[model samples]
Target chain A: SGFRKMAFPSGKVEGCMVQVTCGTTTLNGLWLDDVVYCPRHVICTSEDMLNPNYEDLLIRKSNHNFLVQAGNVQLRVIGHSMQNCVLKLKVDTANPKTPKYKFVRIQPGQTFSVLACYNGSPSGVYQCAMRPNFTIKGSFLNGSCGSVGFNIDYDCVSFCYMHHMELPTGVHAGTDLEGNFYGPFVDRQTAQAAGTDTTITVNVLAWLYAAVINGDRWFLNRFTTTLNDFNLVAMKYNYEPLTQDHVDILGPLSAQTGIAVLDMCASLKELLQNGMNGRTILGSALLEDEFTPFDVVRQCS
Target chain B: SGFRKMAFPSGKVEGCMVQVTCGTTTLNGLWLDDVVYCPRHVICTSEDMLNPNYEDLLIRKSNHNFLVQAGNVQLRVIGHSMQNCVLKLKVDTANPKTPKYKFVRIQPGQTFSVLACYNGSPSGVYQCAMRPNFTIKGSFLNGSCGSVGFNIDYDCVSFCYMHHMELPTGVHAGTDLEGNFYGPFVDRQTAQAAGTDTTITVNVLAWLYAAVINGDRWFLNRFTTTLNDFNLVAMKYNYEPLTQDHVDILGPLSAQTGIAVLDMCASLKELLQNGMNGRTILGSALLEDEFTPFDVVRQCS
Candidate 1:
């Protein structure tokens, strides 16, 4: 457990919530929800009441019970920190401290919930995108004068979206995130990213098709596989030749989400548009212009 | 069984003896050594006694007994052929026919025995090197003694020899053959090649050290890891500093075998030479000249 006890007596404290778990600790009948009954609880003890090095033994007791009788265990806090406050809330859980901040992961047709605190209390729940730079603003009402300050950390993790249709049976399809395999979806329609990774890539057949979901967009007619000297680095979804089911599911998902598709055959693009059925324009769904008949077979088979 | 039965009615015939085992067949008390006791035996029945079709049930019988008793059985022939002779010796065993002809694999200091035939009779045995192009010359005195004919198939398998030393603990040491890892040696000294692969590569630090063990010899001053775009592809040997046992063992083995060393540090070279103890000149051993300090740590650590 990290930060077994922490106190924030005053001031606006800000930090990211980290997912925690019972790391290296046994799990018995103690459920994580119980041990950390108020996972989101932030202590506001006055400075006089705050005690340094106060031990939180709830998790420890749970561990002892777990060792005796194995059962369900839930640990959701990985790590946490507080800034700008002497008396602050501290949470302990199993997670690496390297990231310092926990991020959210989302799949197709999914949403993530975020917490916002105002005056030492959770004020709202915010819904955000995979890469949302938006913020909720509130006027300061405390007796801290009139100065304002802002800090933001803006780094990025590369991402890609793809579409495939009429894929062959036994053909594996997936993506490489950084250097690790992330997908068994798109092909299996069941693959996904760990959401904590950067630089997503879709395996192409003898070619590279890339798009910039962010700024600094550039395009290439086609990149030769010959240049794969810098080798940049599936299939769970059963293959089906263009069917109503595919169009019905993928079309609306792509349209409403407005996700930019990176790689798809010309035929596949046409089929997906048909699936959209004029409900929404398909401009948001990126599709290939040139026909690469053998691309799908080469990649999956 | 590859070729169960055949009779050489007349004339001299030639083929390579294939190692085999009871493939998909049970083993009773049959040992490979026993079933293939006459592994070198080639039948030469007279034309009158030779049957057009023959059934050799020796291996089959052994298989039957093996099925019941679950002992050992041997099958040694992969495949064979007779070019000019009407009748030829045939043996059957468990081996794939993909290679058509099997080649021999020799270890650091191992010998392989080969058989020869003359006028349908056993001739003699010959010892060959890993890539021996040497041939045994025998004069023809009987039958068609006026003319001589020869046939040879010569292709090559790329190979490299390496010297690693001063390795760090927990550093993985090994070589990649083709696309597969085939080492734990030099570190663990327990790894080995399947002896049937075509190309062998040793992993290096930041630089590439290459040599042409065969003809078309050429050398590079130094190749950059930057050029690993075309990534050319173990550590069982425990780590140790310069030791007498190493010098004593590796020096003589290298000297007598006349094996070329492809990669090593300068200090390692000096130590190896010291191991030779002047028993033989070090000219046969190829050692590096440059000094790369962190090379060992970067590779093994």
Candidate 2:
């Protein structure tokens, strides 16, 4: 539990790629989150891979089939490691000193494919958010590393953009984050001291839309219903107005990747000039900000 | 934090009742799974309030327009002090302290009452599941009291009938009481030190059907999907295989109660004659008890 990998000023660690499958053969990955593969071919990183994107379990190849059976459990082009994200593959497919390193991450022209099923480890004993000098080296699954771990703004999309962060400089609800929600610093120096013109490097969708228009409903059902698939993928790829129809059903793999059938056609628009608009952002009737007339319904489901 | 109150033949924390609402008046509750109203009539509990029920929160003679116009916003009866349950109100209706004590349970005479709303303290930091001389005195939520609160057999309905309890004697992956995942004991001496049939007073569906046939899917999608509504109200009131049609939508006031639907239909039919049913009784492919029948369509959702 030493930890030496400091960076911080618009912190860097990026890349992507994943596409390996044995029992039938596919292979072609180039490493986005952290990649490397095939019999002792080594190059894993999941130890704590933060999201450049590819939230949890799917692609991470650096030589899976560790012990080989039919091998190539089908995974396709995954990437990252440019510092990377969510992981716990925790390899044990019949034990061989484990694999899944640096937690996990994958990106770069994503089409998605992960069948790697090694499935083995401690599994759970969570502690979620962290930073008061976080520690807990290697595989803990859910049994150890837990002092406090807020689900933080839906998978903190790459620790608030590689730590030039700035999650919250204030908001002190009675307690949590080991008490007091946030008003100080320690979580990586509260985004390395924030306030660079009142920050927003990726303040987890403005600290999860200020904990859902100012938290409650028990923090909007215990921590922002895992940021409803990134607020329904940013209200169906921006154009807003989506209180919920969860976009005619999610993860069918956008009909095998012709990709999200036109969000006016963008895939990753990335301007989303945050005025915060998922049909008038979170509720309590839009925190009364001129309730106005029309459609809002506010459901987090 | 010292451990007392023992009994454990099946663990006894008896009695149940509650029926309060206040916009159109109604009141009368015995209380279970921790309560706490307002204006300072106070009761407090949830220092793991094991069904000697009536935990805390006062200030509700029903009809609480409290501040008069907003009273305190409403909520209906919430229950469970019996093992295996579902709830996550985790209270935060935007907070003033936090409410929603026991994911909502109140049976004895249901007519949609529980206008029991005050919105008060104890926001989350949880590990859920208590007993190892559990103590916090009044409130902490998930701040200090956590060390691993294993999601105790899906809610441990009424703290394993109160003390004569038989809580986990084995199973260990790493840590809990704060590390969370599994293992433990206690009482008047903890069943004179359990072993009568080697303890059983009430061990919460014997530690939640061994963590639902041996947990994993990141402990069933991060902690048994908050006990899938007490495992679907105990496998649809213990008849089994009753998905979706969910008894044509429950709580028709079940017409003024008879006592927990029938121990909520025999606490999910005790592993169906203890062989554990609904085909392969639960994940780990029913602990390799020869996982067949089209591998249980993997349902826990």
Candidate 3:
């Protein structure tokens, strides 16, 4: 096998480029952490931290999620340097679990989102390829130009709303739990005490996840003009937190499948104030005048 | 009188660079047409097709709108060349008409959307500055490299959904009028016969404009598995096309101010099925439901 072999002179190898060397080795690429980062020449894969399965980067798969730095320097590179550096993915074949890749490249800096998988095996491999040419002067190098490949395991196990949502700035979606998902819809000071800073916006997907599970609770409490109060109400009526399983199971069985709302702020107030009433809110039993109570409760267990 | 003087060259200069003669000219910049295009080195302005009022690019004034090609080369120019080229805007100072500028730059290729102005005067000047250094060879001149300043008039006069909508491949929002806004929610073939091709998506704002005025009618008809059928039904209940004036007038007085929806497709069937009834659909007569219904009706009659 005449695979090109080069010198392994490493000045620096860190972040997404966890391993670097000349010639080809069993070890390759950057390993995935809770946060997978790319600095200069580095690719993320699932195999050896020094030798990655380029064709199936996620070959060492799991059932979790991972994050990347949006402000990564790797994304800032363009032209010649940006050529071989890529975040490639194999598309899911919907049914059969066979890994036949219909690869799609995700240009750096573009928004990358993946939904939870329902009744499905882990979707596909996310291959990050950082060719030797992508190296800077003092960074990674095999001296004569070689590459390192690796991957991190991730799962599509969390729920996410397809549409973007309002949230705190800088905070990851997982961090919302630290604040109890902005529960009870209190004032700024009160919310801060509970751990969430209401003054800022954060990762959209996480906030949506929190809203579906926890936000729905706020509807049962009295109405208030506090932070996210309106959105909470809207969430109660219009949406619910759902795993990928819910989407798969509910897609055809029910007409009210996906969870979403119009003008989260206004929908809350409109439905609460004008759209509901004592008679309308409770049920149509007593208001009907006929034997509604008996008829309505006839099948009630 | 002390402005830098430079040689006027006659090589390139066309498109948005309609005027690139060097030494400071009373004439400046590229003029606004139905389309404001940028070639190599140019700026779009209002006052003079050649001499633009930088502080007030909309100095030419209009009660209309305009468009710029997203693929223009001017936006693709980067680094040293991109320094002086800019698409800038002055913020709308709510109640005051005085042009106190707090300009924000519009980076090339980024989505640029302007909502219709409500009860307000033309919002602010959109200044496009092309410094002499932005030139590329024979294109623009004063061989010594003088700059051209100009603008084109644009009024924030059309309705736009705050959220981006699905649309056609190459059509502009204004062109939808030629197709009647996909009225009556027909099949693709039928819709194309009406001058609108439903098989393709078009500009978001334009599609929304048509949807509000015409798409609402489709709800009264039967439910079918056709293009945008679900979205049409959802739009009927959740949104109405609102002019800038409508947003301004409706903002504080009611809770149902803005128009938008979640899962436009599912919302249609959910509300049509589970969310409504003869009793609930007609709305409650007993409870004096105030804002939403009355406010929604206000836009109609």
DockQ of each: 0.00, 0.02, 0.01
Best by DockQ: 2
- lDDT of predicted model 3: 0.21
Relative to the unseen true structure, what is the C-alpha lDDT of residue B153 in candidate 2, on a scale of 0 to 100? Answer: 24
What DockQ does candidate 1 score? 0.00
Instruction: Residues A136-229, candidate 3: write the lDDT tens digits.
Output: 1111111111122111112111111010111222111110101122123211211221232221011122222223322222223233343355
| Stretches of candidate 3 exceeding 4 Å from the true structure | A1-273, A276-301, B1-172, B175-301
After superposition, which runs of candidate 1 have C-alpha atoms over 4 Å from their true positions? A1-301, B1-103, B108-301
Error of 2 at A250 (Å): 46
lDDT of each: 0.21, 0.22, 0.21
- Residue range B1-301, candidate 2, lDDT tens digits: 0011111111011112223333432222223333312111112233422332222222222222222111334443332121211111111133232212222321111111011111221111111122222311111111111111111122242211111112233111112111112122321112222122211112222223223333311212111222345455444433223233332232221222221222332543443335332233221122221111111111111
The per-residue C-alpha lDDT of model 2 at residue A72 equals: 31
Candidate 2: interface RMSD equals 24.2
Candidates 1 and 3 compared: the better one by TM-score is 3
- The predictions' CA RMSDs to the true structure, in order, are 34.6, 26.4, 25.2
Considering only the true interface residues, what is the Cα RMSD of candidate 1 after superposition? 41.1
Which of the two candidates, 1 or 2, achieves a greater DockQ against the reference? 2
